[PDB]
Each structure stands twice: as C-alpha cells, then as structure tokens.
Amino acid sequence: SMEQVAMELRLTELTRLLRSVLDQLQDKDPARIFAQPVSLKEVPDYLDHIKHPMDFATMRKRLEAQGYKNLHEFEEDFDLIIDNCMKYNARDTVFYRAAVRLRDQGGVVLRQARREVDSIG
Numbered sequence: 001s002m003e004q005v006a007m008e009l010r011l012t013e014l015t016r017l018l019r020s021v022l023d024q025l026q027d028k029d030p031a032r033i034f035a036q037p038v039s040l041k042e043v044p045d046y047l048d049h050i051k052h053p054m055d056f057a058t059m060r061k062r063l064e065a066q067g068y069k070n071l072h073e074f075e076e077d078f079d080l081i082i083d084n085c086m087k088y089n090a091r092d093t094v095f096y097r098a099a100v101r102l103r104d105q106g107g108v109v110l111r112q113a114r115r116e117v118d119s120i121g
C-alpha cells in the first residue's frame with residue numbers, strides 16, 4: 001500500500017539523519033577506542049562483566065539495515081558504548097576518560113538531533 005511506502009520513506013530519511021549523527025559522534029573519538037567490538041580473544045572475560053557490548057561498527061551495521069526505528073533506539077546503543085566502558089575500565093584509564101569526553105561532546109550533537117527529528121517529524 002501507499003501508506004506502507006510513506007512509512008518506509010520516513011524510516012529512510014531517519015536513517016539518513018542518523019548516519020549524519022553517527023559520523024559526527026564518531027569524530028569525537030579520534031583515538032578510535034570505540035570503533036570496533038571488544039575482542040573476546042584479547043579480553044576473554046568481557047562477557048562476564050558486560051552483558052550488552054556495543055561499538056560504532058555494530059551500530060553502523062544496524063543503521064545500514066534501517067534497524068533504528070526512532071532516535072531513542074539509536075541513543076540507547078550510543079549510551080551502551082559509553083556506559084560499558086565506564087564500568088569495565090577504572091577512572092584513571094585512557095579508556096574511561098575517552099568515554100567521558102565522547103559523552104560530553106556527543107550530548108551537544110544529540111541535543112540538536114532530537115530537535116531535528118521532532119521538527120521534521
């Protein structure tokens with residue numbers, strides 16, 4: 001039906017917006033600490049600590065399949081990247097501190113992204 005096509009066009013345009021958001025958020029991680037999933041070869045106990053791992057490459061895979069139906073779902077995955085890092089790694093590490101900075105700089109991007117999603121519908 002035409003109503004289904006219109007819903008699919010809205011999802012397509014959301015996906016385009018979230019791709020711009022994701023690129024901007026990943027620019028705030030120039031070290032590429034959060035670019036890939038935590039390797040279970042290199043960190044064998046990781047799943048004992050973190051139950052829902054997340055990273056930018058995993059988010060990009062879901063995004064290109066139009067897997068994010070709204071901004072909240074996208075935000076939940078971005079928050080996992082930060083929140084998992086700040087639990088596993090201690091306060092005095094480069095990893096924890098990179099997550100703090102990504103959160104702080106990322107909040108600026110997500111604030112305006114919310115306004116664009118609401119405005120454009």
Ligand code: NA
Nearest residue numbers: 086087088089
């Ligand atoms: Na901790």
